Amino acid sequence: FCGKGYHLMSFPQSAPHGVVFLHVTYVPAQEKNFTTAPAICHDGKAHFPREGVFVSNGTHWFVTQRNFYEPQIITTDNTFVSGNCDVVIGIVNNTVYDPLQPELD
C-alpha cells in the first residue's frame, strides 16, 4: 500500500496541487542456501521452533528468524515440544542442549 517492500516510515512533502510522500522501506538482500526440517526428534519428542525455522548448514543445525540469518543453538527454551517423534513426515534426528543441566554440576 505504501511503497514496495516492508513499510518502515514515511514523510509528507508539499506540492502546488498535490502531496508527495516519501515512503522509506526495508528490503532484504544477499540470501544463501540452507537445508531445513519441519521439526526435530529428540529422545522421542518432537521439538518445533518457536520464532523461526530450524536450518541446517550441511553438518550442523540451528534455529533462526525468517527475516534475517542469525544462527543460534537449538535449545529447550527456544523450541516447544508436542506430540510424539513419529507423527509428522519430515523430522530429522538431532540433539537439543538443555541449559539447566550444566548448572547441576
Binding site: 516492508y6 528490503v27 538482500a29 519441519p38 521439526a39 518445533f48 521452533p49 507423527v87 509428522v88 519430515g90
Partner: protein, 90 residues
C-alpha cells in the same frame, strides 16, 4: 455492430499475454509466498509456508503438520467442487 464510422480498437495486452502474467503470478506464490512480492524470490518448501500462514492466523504451527493429510484432501475436494459449480451453474 460496426458499419458507419464506428469501430473498436484492439487491446494492447492479448489473451495469451495476460494468461502469462497470471501464470507467473500463481507460479510465484507457490514457490516463495509473500517474499517474492518484496524483493528476490526465496524458495521455501510449500508445507512449511502453509504452516507459517497458520501461525499467521493464530493456530500453533504443529496443527498443520499433524493434520497435513486432511488439509490436503479438503483443499483438493474444494477445488473440484469449484470446477463443477462453474462447469454447470449458469
Amino acid at each position: 455492430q460496426k458499419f458507419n464510422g464506428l469501430t473498436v480498437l484492439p487491446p494492447l495486452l492479448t489473451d495469451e499475454m495476460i494468461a502469462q502474467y497470471t501464470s507467473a503470478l500463481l507460479a510465484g506464490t507457490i514457490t516463495s509466498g509473500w517474499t517474492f512480492g518484496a524483493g528476490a524470490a526465496l524458495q521455501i518448501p510449500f508445507a512449511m509456508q502453509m504452516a507459517y500462514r497458520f501461525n499467521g492466523i493464530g493456530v500453533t504451527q504443529n496443527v498443520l503438520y499433524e493434520n497435513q493429510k486432511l488439509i490436503a484432501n479438503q483443499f483438493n475436494s474444494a477445488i473440484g467442487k469449484i470446477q463443477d459449480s462453474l462447469s454447470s451453474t449458469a
